[PDB]
Amino acid sequence: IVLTQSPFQSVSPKEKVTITCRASQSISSNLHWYQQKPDQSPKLLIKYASQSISGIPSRFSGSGSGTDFTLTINSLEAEDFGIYFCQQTNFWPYIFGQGTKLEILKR
Amino acid sequence: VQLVQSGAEVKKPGATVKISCKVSGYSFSNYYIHWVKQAPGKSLEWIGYIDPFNGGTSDNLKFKGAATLTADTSTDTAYMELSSLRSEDTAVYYCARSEYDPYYVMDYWGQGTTVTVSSAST
Amino acid sequence: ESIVRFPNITNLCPFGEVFNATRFASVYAWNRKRISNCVADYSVLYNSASFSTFKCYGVSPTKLNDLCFTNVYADSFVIRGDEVRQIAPGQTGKIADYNYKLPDDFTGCVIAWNSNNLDSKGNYNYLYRLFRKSNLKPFERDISTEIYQAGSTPCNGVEGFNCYFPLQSYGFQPTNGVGYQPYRVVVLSFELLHAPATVCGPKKSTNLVKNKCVNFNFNGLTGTGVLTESNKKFLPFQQFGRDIADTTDAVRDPQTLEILDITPCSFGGVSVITPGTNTSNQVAVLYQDVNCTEV
Amino acid sequence: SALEPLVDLPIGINITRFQTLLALHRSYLTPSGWTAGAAAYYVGYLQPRTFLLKYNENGTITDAVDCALDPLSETKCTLKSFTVEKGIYQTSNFRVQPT
Amino acid sequence: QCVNLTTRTQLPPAYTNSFTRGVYYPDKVFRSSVLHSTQDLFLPFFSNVTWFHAIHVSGTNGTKRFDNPVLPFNDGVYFASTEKSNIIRGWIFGTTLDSKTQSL
Ligand SMILES: *[C@@H]1O[C@H](CO)[C@@H](O)[C@H](O)[C@H]1NC(C)=O
Ligand SMILES: *[C@@H]1O[C@H](CO)[C@@H](O)[C@H](O)[C@H]1NC(C)=O
């Protein structure tokens, strides 16, 4: 009941990135994505693994298939990238993603 | 909308830190509070959830500080007492607003509380 | 240093046949199970599939292995997924208001895990009380197969207009998802203190020290002496050896049976042998009736 | 006969009366079947008494003496010694009691 | 169940004399070749012990006599038997010998 993320993803502006949340054995169709800016409280991007809390960019999407839950960003901005987290719920210990620092090139 | 934490706590290992998560901007009794630890440069780590109406303090077993989450309903402030402190407990302790429902979302949090657990004094 | 030597294991508190029981009684009729005369056992629960939740109300979960309990009933039952909410003090809900109801004064557990991995089939034997005319009294159950009577028209043991059988079943669909998965859920009944220790916290046995002046506690027997090996041979049921003075003499190490002597510390009197202070200020100290080490 | 304690159990009830149990069986047609073999046993009631206990050299009570058995045993009890040396010993006093 | 056979007779209880008997160890403490003295419940020596009868045969043909009464516990109880072929198992110890109290 522990979930796996890719530690890093580097992409370019306008290009589509997908960051995976890979949970061991069974998964729960709810998941929660978090963008942690450096030295700042992570902020929930994706709720239920399918929805954004209000005000969050339309480029921020989420999903899951099998045991994986994706953090999918379309058309990045160099303002956008940050450390990304996903969450495991209903399992008692809430294992949050190891975190993924997103880099955006082209600067 | 507002979760304000007691400032950084520097202890010797084995001592106790208790940290205040002060609610404002919403109803305390209608929301559990998640307590989230980020070890410096390390991932998000969730120590437990608390209930406003009750002592529903679940505890994750990854580390052990004999922790108990107390919520002060008059001041809407959930405390996290982290005892048996270790140099690895050094981290930024977030408290996170949770649903009172069986669902688990943390939309809004505290500002985080660094705790430096060391024999090194400030 | 001190030796606290409580016996080996002294039993373990069995909630595994409550958590691991093959066929759970369903939520609508919940088990109430005596765990007693044992030692708090959270140590089987460390290596496990992982209970989908762990909530035990009363006191700190490290007081589980530090604090003994009295009437210990770990409640073995299967509930539908969202119903862990519905199992708690002060819950308005289907589980609480009807089939499985817990007190506002209950000190103990509510713990979830998915049995969709097991209890799922098509199993309609699983059942629940969808409606009942009050809340169950503390730890009370409602067994009623009686007709739920909606109108003043008596149903008389057959179906009719708004004639209901109040208990109902959960169809378990092997495609069940996180909302539709059953959760086997367990509840530890206990009064904390105020009654004898049945879940007696694993009581720390400090490592046994031998051939050294120590301050020892053996199974509640306290004393300070020099613990040594000894050849005197007990009868099996016995506990303390003694002496003519009734003073404790020999003991038996509980965790591994062995016959330990006891003995006084060096004691004796100090004696200052001196020539007259008129001759010298030098003195020779005599420690009486000791062996020359502890000096 | 020295009797070790088997189990010391939390009972907490007062037991004022009892009866033993039996094992019998069934027989088949001979001139219902019941009453296997013969059965007899011994029963006596306990009572507070002061015994001197002579646990053997390797342990185990090998001999015991009641004090209030007869003024005769009271001397071994009062002496606290099994071998009663030739002589006169003063056992506990007696009193006449009021009618 | 509660199949019952009660027969009739008691007879005068055949008594006996426990010479040296009923001395247990009233402690776990190991002692060696010492004279220890306590005042505790015992069966005092040279006492009256009732040698009871059950499934008893007094020969003509058969005539098995089931006498075993419900007996008071009083202060404490001693018990002894031979029974090369066991016919004895346990005891019913209690108070009401019924519900309303516990039962041993
Ligand atoms: C004892 O000491 C005194 C000085 O304090 C000295 O005058 C005297 O001679 C001494 N006597 C002996 C016997 O040592
Ligand atoms: C003192 O101890 C030594 C060994 O530690 C032993 O050989 C000796 O007999 C002891 N003597 C006394 C007086 O206890």
What spacing in Å lies between the alpha carbon of C273 and ligand 1's midpoint?
A: 19
Handedness of CA D31, D33, D37, D39 (dihedral sign): negative
C-interface mutation test, from A30, A91, A95, most C Cβ less than 10 A away: A91
A–C CB contacts, 8 A cutoff, strictly below: 19
In sequence order, the 6+-apart residues with CB closer than 8 A to the CB of E50 are D42, D43, D44, E13, E14, E15, E16
Q: Is residue C281 a contact partner of residue C33, using CB atoms and an 8 Å limit?
A: no
Q: If you compute the radius of gyration of chain C from its CA atoms, what whole number of angstroms results? A: 31
**Residue B9: both structure tokens together:** 């706590």
What spacing in Å lies between the alpha carbon of E17 and ligand 1's midpoint?
A: 86
Strand order in the sheet with C213-218: C2-5, C213-218, C221-226
Straight-line distance from the first to the last Cα atom of chain D, in angstroms, rounded to the nearest whole number: 42
How far is Cα D34 from Cα D27, in angstroms, rounded to an integer? 7
In sequence order, the 6+-apart residues with CB closer than 8 A to the CB of B69 are B33, B35, B48, B49, B50, B57, B78, B79, B80, B81
Q: Does B73 touch chain C (CB under 8 A)?
A: no
- Distance of alpha carbon D87 from the chain centroid: 31
Comparing CA positions, the residue from A64, A63, A42, A37 lying closest to residue A51 is: A63
Would the CB atoms of A90 and C51 count as touching at under 8 Å? no
Nearest-CB residue to A29 (from C50, C52, C177): C177
In sequence order, the 6+-apart residues with CB closer than 8 A to the CB of A43 are A34, A35, A36, A37
Please tell me which chains touch A, using 3 or more CB pairs under 8 Å as the contact test: B, C
Would the CB atoms of A94 and B103 count as touching at under 8 Å? no
**Per residue, what are the HEC states of chain C?**
CEEEECCCCCCCCCCHHHHCCCCCCECCCCCCCEECCEECCCCCCCCCCCCCEEEECCCCCCCCCCCCCCCEEECCEEEEHHHHCCCCCCCCCHHHHHHCCCCCCCECEEEEEECCCCCCCCCCCCEEECCCCCCCCCCCCCCCCCCEECCCCCCCCCCCCCEECCEEECCCCCCCCCCCCEEEEECEEECCCCCCCCEECCCCCCCCCCCCEEEEEECCEEEEEECEECCCCCCCCCCCEECCCCCECCEECCCCCCEEECCCCCCCCEEEECCCCCCCCCCEEEECCCCCCCC
Torsion of CA E85, E87, E90, E96, to 10 degrees: -160
Closest-approaching ligand to the CA atom of C228: 2
Q: Does C62 touch chain B (CB under 8 A)?
A: yes
How far is Cα A55 from Cα E22, in angstroms, rounded to an integer? 89
Closest-approaching ligand to the CA atom of C266: 2
How far is Cα C279 from Cα B40, in angstroms, rounded to an integer? 74
Would the CB atoms of D39 and E42 count as touching at under 8 Å? no
Handedness of CA C141, C147, C148, C152 (dihedral sign): negative
Would the CB atoms of E64 and D44 count as touching at under 8 Å? no
Q: What's the CATH number for B2-117?
A: 2.60.40.10
**Per residue, what are the HEC states of chain A?**
CCEEECCEEEECCCCCEEEEEEECCCCCCCCEEEEECCCCCCEEEEECCCEECCCCCCCEEECCECCEEEEEECCCCCCCCCEEECECCCCCCCEECCCEEEEECCC
What number of other Cβ atoms are within 10 A of residue D98's Cβ?
Answer: 4
Given the structure tokens 């005042």, which residue do they identify? Answer: E39
Type and span of the H or E element at B48: strand B44-50
Would the CB atoms of A29 and C178 count as touching at under 8 Å? yes
> What class, spelled out in words, does domain A3-104 have in CATH?
mainly beta
Please report residues of B whose CB lies closer than 8 A to that of A44: 105-107
Chains A and E touch (3+ CB pairs under 8 A): no
Would the CB atoms of B44 and A44 count as touching at under 8 Å? no
Position A25, amino acid: Q
Q: Is residue B85 a contact partner of residue B15, using CB atoms and an 8 Å limit?
A: yes
Tell me, in Å, the resolution of the deposited structure: 3.4
Experimental method: cryo-EM
Report the DSSP pairing between strands A8-11 and A100-104.
Answer: parallel
**Strand pairing partners for D51?**
D66, E38
Type and span of the H or E element at D73: helix D71-79
Residue A4's alpha-carbon distances to A18, A99, C94, C109, C117, in angstroms, are: 14, 9, 36, 31, 22
At D39, is the secondary structure helix, strand, or coil? strand
Please report residues of C whose CB lies closer than 8 A to that of D11: none
At D74, is the secondary structure helix, strand, or coil? helix
Closest-approaching ligand to the CA atom of C280: 1
At D16, is the secondary structure helix, strand, or coil? coil
What spacing in Å lies between the alpha carbon of C291 and ligand 2's midpoint?
A: 6
Comparing CA positions, the residue from C60, C4, C78, C69 lying closest to residue C39 is: C69
How far is Cα C56 from Cα B96, in angstroms, rounded to an integer? 21
Comparing CA positions, the residue from C91, C95, C175, C86 lying closest to residue C128 is: C95
How far is Cα C29 from Cα C127, in angstroms, rounded to an integer? 9
In sequence order, the 6+-apart residues with CB closer than 8 A to the CB of A104 are A10, A11, A12, A13, A76, A77, A78, A80, A81
Would the CB atoms of C235 and D10 count as touching at under 8 Å? no
Q: If you compute the radius of gyration of chain E from its CA atoms, what whole number of angstroms results? A: 18
How far is Cα C77 from Cα C94, in angstroms, rounded to an integer? 15
Query: Where along chain A do its domains lie?
Result: 3-104
- Nearest chain C Cα distance for residue B79, angstroms: 14
Handedness of CA C84, C85, C86, C88 (dihedral sign): positive
How far is Cα C28 from Cα C98, in angstroms, rounded to an integer? 8
Would the CB atoms of E32 and C237 count as touching at under 8 Å? no
Nearest-CB residue to C52 (from A29, A30, A92): A92
